[PDB]
Each structure stands twice: as C-alpha cells, then as structure tokens.
C-alpha cells in the first residue's frame, strides 16, 4: 500500500556500463524501453540515507543501538562482518520495488521509438590538463542524461513482524521518513549535480520525523528475530484416487532470477521455474485447509516445474532424440529435424543433436514440426559500495550480474492433489480455487527489483492417458530425474533406471537392436541449491536432464496403461514433489518420423 514517489529535480543518469551509439554511457531502461530507477539503486540509496540518520543518533558510533535498527529494517550486511557472528543474518523488513514513470505516460510512448530516445540527451564532458589548460588526450566523453522533471513511483512493502509494539512501529516509520527526507541525490555523478531528487513515502511526513525527534532518547533495542517455523498436524486423510490436476499459470511482472550457476561474477538463470519456488505459495494459501507439510512428506502433493506456455499448455523440454541439420536445420530453422529413435541419419549431411528449449504439442499425424517456445532473458549488472570511500572496492566485491527472465513471460505449472485432499479442502471452502490467485515473489533477490510474479489458477484438467503399446516402451524425461543407487547415493545408472521401471511396471525391457537407430539419449545433470529453512545448502542432487529420452523393446509381460498413467501423475525417483521425475510415456513426438515435416498508444 506504501509507495515511494521520486521527483527528479536535475537531469539524471543510472545503471549501465554499455553505451550504444555515439554516446559513451547509456542509462538503465525498463521493459517499455523507458528510463527508470532500479529497486536495488533505490534500496541502496535509501539505506545510505537512513544510515546517516542512525549514525547521527548514535553520536557517530558506527555500531550501536540505532545501527541495530537499520539492520532490523534493512537486514544485516554479512560480508561486512569483522568477527565471529553466531546468529544467522536477518532479512530486511522493507522491500522496495523499481520506480517507473507514470503508467499513463508510459502507454503513450508505445512503439514511438523516436520519442523514447528523446527522453534523454547527450551531455558532453572533457578533462583539462592543469598546466596547459587544454583538453587531455583520451579524456572526452558524451553521456546520456534523462530530462529533469521525471516523476517516478515505486511500490514499497513493510512486512512488519506480527507482534511489533506500536512504539516500535512509530520508530520504524520515523527512521524511514527521516532517511527519505535526508535523501537528496541518486545515480551517477551525484557529486557533480546529476540526479538530484525529492524522495517521499506515501503516508510518512514531518509528523513521523517530529515524533522521533521528540522520543529518540526513549528508544530500546529492536526485537529479536525469529524464524517462522513449520507446524504439522498429522491429520490429513489417506491419499485416494483420482488425482485432481489444477493448472497454475505464472506470469512474470518483473524480472525473475532463478540461479542455475555462478560463473565468475555473473549468476546464470534457469529458463523455467522449479516447483520448489512455489511450495512457499502453496504453504501460504492451502496450509490453512490441510497439513501441507505432511502432504509433502507423504507425497500427496506435487507442484511441477513451470515451463513456457505453448499452445495454451506447458512447453515440454526438447527431446534429445531430435537431431537437426548442422548446416541449416533444426527446430530453430523449422526444417531438417530427424527423430533418431525411428529414422536413420541421411547420407552425407551431418547432424547436431538438440540441446534445449521447449516444444509445444504434437500429435500422431501432426504434418508439422511441433511449436517451439523460447524464453527471453536479460543481464542486469549491479555494484556494492564501500561506505567510507563511497565507491566499490575489491574488499566488498563491487561488481556482479544476474541473468533474469524478463517481464511478461508466461509459464504453466500444475498442482496435483489426490481426491482425498480436495475433499478435505472442499468440505472447508467451496471456492478454494479462487484463493489460488496471488501475486508472490520468487527467486534470488526476491525482495526488491526481481521476482514479482502473478499466479492464476485454471480449471481442473484431465489426467494424462498414454497409449499402452506392447511393442516398445519409450520414456521422455519432461523434468530432471533423480535416482539413488542401491547405496542410496545418487550414482545411479541407466541400468538402475531400467530396473526401476521394470520393477514398477511389472515388465521386462531390453534395448532395441536396430543399428541405425539410437536407443538412449541422456545427459547427466547436477543441481546445487540452498535450503532456506536449514540455512545450509542442500545435499547435491545428481541425475539426468529434462529432455533425455530412451526407448525399450518389451521383452515379456504386458505394460498396463493404468500404471503408466499413475506414473505420469506422480513421477519417478527422488523429490518428485518438487516436480523432479516428471516423465512422458509413448508420446508420439518420440514415435514419429520427422525428416519430411516443416513448421507451420493513446
């Protein structure tokens, strides 16, 4: 409900090392291609102004009662620690979004590329040799500055503790009103007049500062931090068929950072939302109706990965049995794609295996290549200022980058619940699927610039119903499969996977013998991830990537489509509740032969 409104009173520059045209440095621009103040700039600037206030109230003591309050509101800075710290770092109470131009003005810009450039102008700069008084060689630059008078507004959230006394609430409001009013400048070249601003909270005024002036001598230490522990009841019904499948549509309202790995100083991003990111929202919304924590432990609940929406459905990870013509083919070209589970390599022309992306739907007489979805992503670069030199330094890292999924992307997950848990809910709330609409924050850096997503629930979809072909069984890994070897570590092998399905389905399987046709097309996967509740990284999870494929000739018995359906719901292997293990049997995209086909302001 809170906003920050920023009125820019001189021309202002922010955010980018890159430079485009005849300008040397270019300003940060949002998804509408309009300039804006990133939420991490806004937090870092506002924190700094609150740090000055607290530093004054402490009579200049750099640690003290009032610096405790800053660490309460804005969270601790680990990596400024100078000695042994035994408590875990506190997160911030205050989340501050990015500040954007007025939405009705932003609509007027749409498509008017020449006007979006005109919001800024080149500012020249020269450096002058002190003895000769003439410009130094090399020392010439031209810089983009955005026109003064821009009025920008940011959403702010204060998720205060459920128990904070009204005296302490007035202290928090006092500091934030104080730090806002002390804030006078932001962005680049502040010390030389760029980026002068008025920063105001909605609903904080001089009354908030005046109360603090009247009362700061009375103020105590902040309350101690406490984790929100889980709480089980153990009261759930037994799981009973059927399984209800509730599609959840996720739409990114700001960039989302979903850490794949760090290489150097750049955090790389996944191109899907793992199901673990949604368990916090499932806990928020359904934990009032049934014991969500017990359901996870019993496996009565699955939230799949969210993959890019194609054909109105979740895009499916591209099967590694597809190979494209290396010269000018593949799904990116829309032609020259061979399903190597069924087609020989053509003579002469060499192929490259498919390695990523998602395909839409395909049917056993598609006459076309399946619709292929792409996920757009952007690189955001940040810095960390050392407070005494007021510039970044090696002692504080100083430069880092996030890849992020940009805004406006749409993803589809599915929550699956057994019939007995939907009965539990519906006995308590008939409209419970209405409570699944939410806006939530997921990811890395979720509390500021990144991570804002809409969730919308669809209507209950039908259970998947694969074809029970007794000739070949074919398995498409729609999600990463984690298996444990018989030593309970993850060093399982594809022969352990044969036994798993063989044992699970009551059939014997053997690799197909056709010398031109590949039978197995896996790649290894390793996931490294934190666990926030533990405060320690998860054990490393090893398995096979989504998109991996294999096909077996059935040696004896008969495969039962009833059991294939059930595995397509609950998945196979470890941690299926996070959407690992999700799998597709006998999908015709593995069965078909593809080489002949082609793709379809105010």
């Amino acid at each position: 409900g809170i906003e920050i409104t920023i009125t820019m009173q001189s021309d202002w520059h922010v955010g980018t090392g890159m430079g485009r045209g005849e300008l040397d440095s270019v300003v940060q621009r949002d998804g509408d291609n309009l300039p804006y103040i990133p939420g991490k700039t806004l937090t870092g600037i506002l924190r700094d102004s609150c740090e000055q206030v607290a530093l004054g109230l402490d009579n200049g003591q750099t640690r003290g009662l009032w610096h405790g309050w800053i660490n309460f509101i804005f969270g601790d800075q680990p990596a400024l620690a100078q000695g042994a710290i035994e408590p875990e770092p506190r997160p911030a109470l205050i989340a501050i979004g990015s500040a954007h131009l007025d939405p009705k003005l932003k609509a007027a810009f749409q498509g008017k590329k020449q006007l979006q450039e005109a919001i800024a102008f080149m500012k020249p700069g020269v450096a002058i040799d002190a003895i000769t008084g003439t410009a130094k060689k090399d020392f010439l630059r031209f810089e983009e500055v955005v026109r003064l008078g821009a009025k920008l507004t940011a959403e702010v959230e204060l998720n205060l503790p459920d128990n904070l006394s009204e005296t302490n609430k007035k202290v928090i409001a006092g500091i934030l009103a104080s730090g806002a009013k002390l804030t006078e400048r932001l962005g680049g070249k502040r010390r030389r007049g760029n980026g002068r601003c008025e920063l105001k909270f909605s609903g904080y005024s001089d009354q908030q500062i005046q109360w603090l002036k009247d009362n700061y001598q009375s103020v105590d230490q902040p309350p101690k931090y406490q984790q929100n522990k889980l709480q089980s009841a153990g009261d759930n019904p037994e799981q009973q068929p059927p399984w209800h499948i509730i599609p959840l549509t996720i739409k990114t309202l700001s960039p989302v950072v979903l850490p794949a790995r760090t290489v150097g100083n750049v955090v790389e991003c996944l191109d899907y939302i793992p199901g673990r990111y949604l368990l916090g929202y499932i806990h928020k919304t359904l934990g009032e109706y049934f014991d969500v924590s017990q359901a996870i432990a019993a496996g009565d609940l699955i939230i799949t990965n969210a993959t890019i929406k194609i054909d109105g459905k979740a895009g499916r990870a591209t099967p590694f049995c597809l190979f494209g013509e290396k010269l000018d083919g593949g799904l990116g070209k829309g032609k020259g794609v061979y399903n190597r589970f069924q087609e020989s390599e053509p003579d002469g022309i060499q192929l490259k295996g498919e390695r990523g992306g998602y395909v839409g739907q395909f049917e056993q007489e598609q006459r076309n290549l399946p619709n292929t979805g792409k996920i757009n992503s952007e690189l955001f670069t940040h810095n960390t200022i050392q407070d005494d030199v007021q510039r970044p330094t090696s002692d504080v890292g100083g430069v880092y980058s996030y890849e992020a999924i940009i805004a406006g992307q749409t993803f589809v997950a599915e929550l699956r619940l057994p019939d007995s848990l939907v009965k539990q809910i519906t006995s308590k709330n008939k409209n419970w699927q209405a409570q699944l609409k939410a806006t939530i924050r997921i990811g890395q850096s979720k509390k500021d610039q990144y991570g804002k997503i809409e969730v919308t629930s669809g209507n209950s979809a039908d259970l998947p119903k694969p074809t029970g072909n007794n000739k070949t069984l074919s398995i498409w890994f729609l999600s990463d499969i984690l298996l444990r070897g018989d030593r309970l570590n993850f060093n399982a092998t594809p022969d352990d996977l044969k036994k798993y399905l063989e044992n699970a389905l009551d059939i014997k399987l053997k690799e197909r013998s056709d010398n031109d046709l590949i039978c197995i097309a896996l790649r290894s996967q390793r996931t490294e991830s934190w666990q926030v509740r533990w405060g320690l990284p998860r054990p490393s999870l090893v398995g096979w990537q989504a998109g991996s494929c294999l096909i077996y000739d059935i040696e004896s018995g008969t495969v039962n489509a009833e059991k294939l359906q059930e595995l397509m719901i609950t998945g196979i292997g470890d941690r299926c509740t996070e959407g690992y293990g999700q799998i597709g049997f006998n999908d015709p995209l593995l069965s078909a032969s593809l080489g002949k086909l082609t793709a379809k302001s105010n």
Partner: protein
C-alpha cells in the same frame, strides 16, 4: 588379421578450461586436458604393453615419433611382433589398434583410472570395437563405428559430476559449485578456499611451461610476469581460431586415400593428423613475429586460442591464417587429400577475436570469441565449390572481431543490433575474408568475398592513418560517423557536403559514384567506414 580399435576421447573441454576466469586455472586446466591423451596415454600404453612410447615422447617432446615404422610398427603382418599400434594420438583424442581384447580393455582402464587420480574433474573415457582386416576397408569402418558408439556409451556412463558431492556442512570453492577441500592464495596473497578440482588445475599451471617452451623459448616462461605484464598493457585480445572442413574429410576419408586398403588408410589417416598438428604449430611460430606477450591456452590439431596483446591480434590472426594456408599448400600429406576433397590443395581456418581491456572478465570475453567465430564461419556457406552437391564450402579464411569498450552487457545480438540502426542499413561489414582474391576466383560467391575482403578494411585504415597533417581529419571522420547513425538519405547528405573537400574520400566511397559510404549488399545497405574507424588502432605489426 583381426584385432580391436581403441578410441579414447576427452569430453567437456570448453567447460573444463574456459569457465573460471582465473588465468592460472585456464592454463592449468588446458594442460591437464593435453596431458590426458599424450603423457598419460603413452604412460598407460607403456604400463600395459611394455612399450617405450613415453620415452620417445619425453625425449622428442613431439608426436611425430609414432609415424616412424621402427618406433610405431604395424600391427599387421608377422614381420613385427608388436601387439599395439598407435593409429593417432592428439589433444583430446587418441586411437590405437590392439590385437587382444583384454589389453584393449586394460588400456582404457589404465588411462581412465589415472585421470580420476591425477586429473580430477577431467572427463575422459574410451571405447573399443571389433576391427576386421579381412574386410579391405574394415579399419575405416571401425573408426566410424567407434566414433558413433562413443556418444551412445557416454550417456550410459557415470558422469564426472558424480563425485565431490556436497554435504550441507561443507564450504564452497570460491570458483566453482563444488565443495571446498583445499586452500590456495589470491593474487594479493589472501588465502582462499578451493576445490580439489581447482587445486590440481592451479598446481598444473607450471607443468605447461615445459611443453610450450619447446614450441618457442619465449612463451609462458614466467606465468606470474605474464599476469603482471597483461595488467600493464592497454588491451588484450582473446583469439579463437578453428580449422575448416577437417571433420567432413575425416568422416569420409575412404574416398580420398586412393588405394582401398587398410594399411593405406592407417598410413594416410595418421599422417594427415600429424601434418595438421605441425601446420598449426608452424603457422603460430610464424605469426608471433608481429609482436612473448601471448599465452597459448590451446594450440594443436586445427585449433588455436590464445590471449594476445590487443592491438596486435588482427595481424597475428591474419598472419596465422595466411601462414596456416601456406603451410597446408606445401605439406604433401594434406595436399593430395585436400585436392581430392575440395579441388584445391589447401585447407582453411576462421577466427573470432574479442579484444578486451585487461581487467574485463575472461569467461565473458571468450564467450564473445565463440560467437564471433560463428560469424566468421558463415563464409562456410556463402563461398562454395561450384556445382558441388551437397554443396561444400570452398576453402576460405575469415575473421570477425569486436573491441568491446564496455563494462557489462556483452550480448553479441545486442552488440550487433545496436549498430544496425535502420531496417535497410547495417553499419558493419565485419565477417572479413583474409584469403587472397586469387585463390577464391573460381568459387561461387567470389564477388561476395571481394566485397568482404580484409584488404578493403586494411586499405581504408591506411588512408585514415595516412598523412604533415591528417589526409582526412579526425574532425571530419567524426562528422561522418555521426551521420551514419541517421537514415541513409541523411548519411549521404552529410557525405556530399564533404566529398569534394577531402579528395581522399574517393577511396572511402562504395557506391561507384563517390557519393555514398554505403554499398548495397543482399538488399541491405552496409559500410566499411565504421569498421575502419573502430579498427584503426588495432592494425599494428612489428614488421
């Protein structure tokens, strides 16, 4: 005769070597990769077969020894008792012929076990396949069957990621997702945690000295002074260069050996691989004349990548590619196979060249060089052997280069569209052909190659650089530069204000009328003028 063909090959090289930004680990990681199929192969062969391949390697410090019939005998015929023959050994790959399955198996065990111990985190495996010599062509079939089945058996194998698994309580590597296990030191001497993987890379950085200093006594002689020296310098350049067509040759080589006999295929196939390796090495030794301030991360086969001094990298790569063509024209063992394959007796390579300010992250700058090489490698479709079918690229060598001038962003797609200002216009001609116009004159796409010839850029740079005062003032070059970002009508308008004041501008025209800096190309308008202004100071040579 009957026997087995062993293939041993190293996977994941680009991830293992180029991920970590630390110069010592990239050198160290590349060394462990080279040693795995040479030093460790020959030691592995010697421990299994009781041969002395390692002694000849370490005395000669070169692979040429395994060409010599006394030093690497035929497995076939009774005249020699040898039970092993190395068909090929090279960086990242090795192939051997063995007459017993158990020794074939034991060789692969021996080599891979040593990799697990001495080179943790290196991914290496092998395959052996039945080789039948009563088929006159079975050895060529064995090679292709071995390469085919190796991919399939890689999947049904335990990955290199299946070890060093994180426990929640174990600290992190500083440079990797792996759990820390060891300590090392920052360049400023502060202690840092590292993994066993990064520890062994950093340790092995010294072992690379002995190999490269045999290539030239100047190279990598004191690694810490290279790091110090690079920081003093103004620009670096990550160069990546890659050979064209060898893969299609070697997948089809039965067609070009002449006599359809196993012994000839081995003899030809072995010599070709060694010949390429020498051509790459010889061309590199020629190219360094343009400059010590050059670090080979990879040098071998058809493949080169080095961190050069910047503003010497266009000439080093031009000189390298020209020298590499000249080597492959003169080397007999390539000449006839290339002549039969492509109608001309030479091979070719292309290069991607980042050119970076020295502190900028290497792992990012190398990812550019991987994208620039793909653009330079587009000649492999626009210039082609006439009436070939399926159409084969004609041997042509080309460059693409960048010169970053940025602190963060580095997206080839953003980079190139931000200087493609109008839908009819692009301000770059940058995939430049370095092959001489004489060699290309009988390919399709000849006129395209001439519009893209590097000599057009190198000439234009000389005019900009030519002079007691500039022939074209910088004052005026920057007027043109600004106008190029406008519509072509406005760009031509500004040139027409100038074109008669500076008679040198007749040489920069491209219209054939001396009234536009743009020429039409594939329906687009494109110009060399902005490449010449960019590259003006990155055409320096000790010659």
């Amino acid at each position: 005769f009957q026997g087995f063909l062993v293939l041993i090959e190293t996977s994941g090289n680009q991830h293992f070597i180029f991920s970590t930004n630390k110069l010592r680990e990239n050198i160290g990681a590349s060394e462990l990769t080279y040693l795995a199929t040479t030093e460790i192969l020959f030691q592995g062969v010697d421990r299994v077969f009781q041969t002395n391949y390692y002694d000849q390697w370490s005395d000669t410090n070169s692979l040429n020894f395994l060409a010599d019939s006394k030093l690497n005998p035929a497995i076939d015929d009774p005249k020699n008792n040898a039970d092993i023959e190395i068909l090929l050994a090279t960086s990242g790959k090795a192939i051997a012929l063995v007459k017993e399955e158990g020794k074939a198996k034991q060789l692969i065990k021996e080599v891979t076990k040593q990799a697990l111990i001495n080179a943790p985190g290196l991914e290496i495996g092998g395959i052996y396949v039945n080789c039948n010599w009563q088929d006159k062509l079975g050895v060529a079939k064995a090679v292709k069957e071995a390469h085919k089945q190796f991919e399939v058996n890689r999947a049904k194998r335990a990955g290199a990621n299946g070890r060093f698994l994180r426990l929640p309580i174990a600290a992190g590597c500083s440079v990797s997702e792996l759990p820390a296990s060891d300590f090392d030191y920052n360049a400023d001497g502060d202690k840092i945690p590292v993994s066993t993987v990064s520890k062994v890379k950093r340790e092995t950085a010294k072992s690379a000295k002995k190999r490269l200093r045999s290539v030239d006594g100047r190279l990598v002689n004191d690694l810490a002074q290279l790091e110090k020296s690079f920081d003093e310098l103004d620009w670096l350049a990550v160069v990546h260069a890659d050979g064209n067509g060898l893969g299609q040759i070697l997948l089809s080589l039965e067609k070009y050996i002449g006599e359809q006999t196993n012994r000839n295929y081995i003899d030809k196939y072995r010599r070709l691989s060694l010949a390429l390796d020498n051509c790459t090495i010889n061309a590199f030794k020629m190219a360094i004349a343009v400059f010590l301030p050059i670090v080979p991360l990879i040098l071998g086969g058809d493949d080169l990548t080095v961190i050069c001094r910047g503003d010497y990298a266009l000439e080093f790569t031009r000189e390298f590619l020209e020298a590499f063509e000249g080597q492959t024209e003169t080397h007999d063992d390539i000449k006839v196979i290339a002549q039969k394959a492509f109608g001309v007796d030479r091979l070719s390579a292309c290069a991607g060249i980042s050119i970076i300010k020295p502190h900028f992250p290497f792992s990012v700058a190398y990812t550019l060089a991987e994208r620039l090489i793909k653009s330079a490698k587009e000649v492999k479709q626009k210039v082609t052997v006439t009436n070939s079918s399926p159409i084969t690229p004609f041997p042509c060598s080309a460059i693409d280069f960048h010169i970053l001038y940025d602190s963060s962003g580095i997206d080839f797609d953003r980079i190139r569209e931000k200087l493609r200002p109008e839908d009819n216009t692009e301000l770059y001609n940058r995939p430049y052909v370095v092959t001489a116009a004489e060699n290309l004159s009988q390919a399709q796409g000849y006129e395209w190659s001439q519009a893209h010839s590097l000599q057009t850029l190198a000439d234009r740079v000389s005019y900009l650089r030519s002079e007691g005062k500039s022939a074209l003032p910088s004052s005026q070059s920057h007027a043109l530069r600004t106008a190029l970002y406008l519509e072509k009508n406005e760009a031509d308008a500004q040139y027409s204000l100038i074109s008669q004041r500076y008679k040198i501008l007749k040489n920069f025209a491209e219209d054939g009328e001396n009234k536009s800096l743009f020429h039409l190309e594939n329906g687009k308008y494109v110009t060399r003028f902005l490449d010449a202004l960019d590259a003006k100071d990155f055409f320096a040579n000790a010659n």
